[PDB]
Symmetry: D2
Subunit: 213 residues, 4 copies
């Protein structure tokens, strides 16, 4: 595939739609305001639209390596603030994927360059739950950390001032932590769904303790 190859595909796809529904493009124009925010990995092993059946225009999408929500990352925080405060999305979905290249690179700690500093936030989670992962067999640890990371990012997101402000002013926003595998593409709900400050805590604590079993 070269750049020209992708360009030609774009023109064809454009023509095909006009022939079938020349009003489609019109539709998107007036497609309201997205009601969901997708925070996913830059791997994008399966795009969010195929996984969820969501159409172009009802998804606000941000993607970074290993789908992180760092307390001081203005990139992700600007997305969250713009979605929550301006677009007023009602659901924020943090979704990781088993086999993530970033999560595994975090654990094996190879000299990869600038990215290693970003992956240290995941390694912090690795050691934070050093006990929990210890109770599990080695093979099932890299997948569990992937679920552990997603729960942590939600916790973080719920602690940021953007989310805390919305919940205190009564805005209806709900945070969800999901994961899917390339073995079946099936979304697994990690059960950390939060709608206010108190549920964020209880969900996170119960999420971790439930993994102990």
């Amino acid at each position: 595939k070269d750049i020209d190859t992708l360009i030609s595909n774009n023109a064809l796809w454009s023509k095909m739609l006009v022939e079938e529904d020349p009003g489609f493009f019109e539709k998107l124009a007036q497609a309201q305001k997205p009601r969901f925010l997708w925070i996913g990995c830059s791997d994008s092993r399966v795009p969010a639209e195929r996984l969820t059946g969501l159409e172009p225009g009802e998804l606000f999408v941000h993607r970074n390596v290993a789908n992180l929500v760092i307390h001081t990352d203005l990139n992700c925080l600007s997305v969250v603030q713009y979605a929550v405060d301006v677009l007023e999305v009602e659901h924020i979905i943090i979704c990781g994927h088993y086999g993530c290249g970033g999560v595994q690179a975090a654990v094996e700690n190879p000299e990869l360059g600038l990215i290693n500093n970003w992956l240290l936030h995941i390694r912090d989670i690795w050691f934070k739950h050093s006990s929990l992962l210890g109770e599990m067999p080695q093979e099932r640890r890299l997948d569990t950390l992937c679920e552990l990371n997603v729960m942590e990012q939600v916790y973080n997101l719920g602690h940021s001032t953007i989310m805390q402000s919305a919940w205190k002013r009564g805005q209806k926003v709900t945070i969800h932590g999901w994961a899917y595998g390339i073995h079946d593409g099936l979304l697994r709900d990690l059960d950390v769904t939060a709608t206010n400050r108190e549920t964020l805590e209880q969900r996170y604590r119960h999420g971790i303790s439930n993994l102990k079993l």
Copy 2:
């Protein structure tokens, strides 16, 4: 409206159906080698990149922020690019904006939106930098032009970072492209700033500005 239960249910159906049609599809994902493209696009994601370009899941490293910015000091985007260029060894990086972007329009109309306004100040800087150009055009012909100007500047910024400069200096083949598409037809317009090294990055940028003037 559409709820979470719909998305979860859509996923289970889509998953089983695929097993029915191509049970090897999920195996392909694995075999799929490292991606070859980095897609830096807006969080609006009015049309997902995979449909616009006909690229299937696994051939795209995807990053999205408000108005697809490449700020010199944003570790988020820079970590993505470095992982793509140095670890994944992508050979094409595509920065793609879209006419009608809410962020670019918010930059120009300057409403009090909160935290996001600071992120958009990088666009207002692009507004005044080419304040002369925009004056020569009719008002209608400005909001689309800034959208194209912003994408060219981000392509410029990307090429000036140490990650790109180091890769080009060590002879690695990476090519940066600046595109835009409209929601009226979905046709990608190549902004003609395609760069393959330090000299081309300047020459094309030099070439770009003058033709738009």
Copy 3:
């Protein structure tokens, strides 16, 4: 001078104070809510307290390479927000210094590594005012860019949501741009002092115009 020296120097200074001035720690003990924010260079060739004769406790200080105020740097912005909104500072001073290593590295562009990306914000100021620097004598260009850099950061500071919100709610905050030389330690006022949105605009443009002469 080594580490052991610094520890020993501290112990002497500690008792000497107890012996000579036991009230020094009494002043430090009281509230001493600061009224000034110092945004300066990490070079710190002359500490801010020595330049201004300010006593310990009345200075909130942030320092980075070449005293930058980037729109998307949560570090600098959090200091300013804590100063303006919590500490209620009435003056913010952005101060550069002639001979700055960062300003010199920005222009000569050596391959220094990660720092080069931070310094790219300065090269933006170098080309933005390429007109001014060309008309001036060669020797006085690096000193002028140092003055240009300080004026731009004051401009950026006034554009942030923190300052715009405070001025819009009537809070008394005043931003100043200064510079000092290593030949005499004399502070030069760059005359871009802003107290509101309107003063920020004219003062900026104003500041630039006399340098053209």
Copy 4:
């Protein structure tokens, strides 16, 4: 407004030295690359030069709220990289101060605005050592967290790619964690002094283990 007060003090202080000690400006004019990097709190209750008796020019200084070293803060990381790779400092000192306003705000968690997101990195420390702080009387927790934060930031600093790359190339760099009180200004060495990755690990664990009793 006391800007005029500060302005005259400079001019006064400037002539005073020029008349009395014209070499003060000669020493500062001498190209003395610093040997120490100071990462301290923006409170700057006692300036670093007064605490250590260090004279102008041998101190590279960075200050943020509660002297944090975040894995993804390019501000602090650009300072560290420039010091270690360009200036080749031989010592980095992370110094907190008991009674720090930021450390206290993290624990009491008042709604202060944007700064609260920065302080969540400290709240991370507070809950990470929930066991240790729990075993101590309430009165001795805010001071302990202050020492805990300094150990963690030294831990974070030693894990960054800048330090890891520098140590692996054989460069001599040493990280130190200190604290001082407003009651006496006496530096207490927290005993986390690291010269390589292995010592950083052992130092950190022993630091936490010693606090247990």
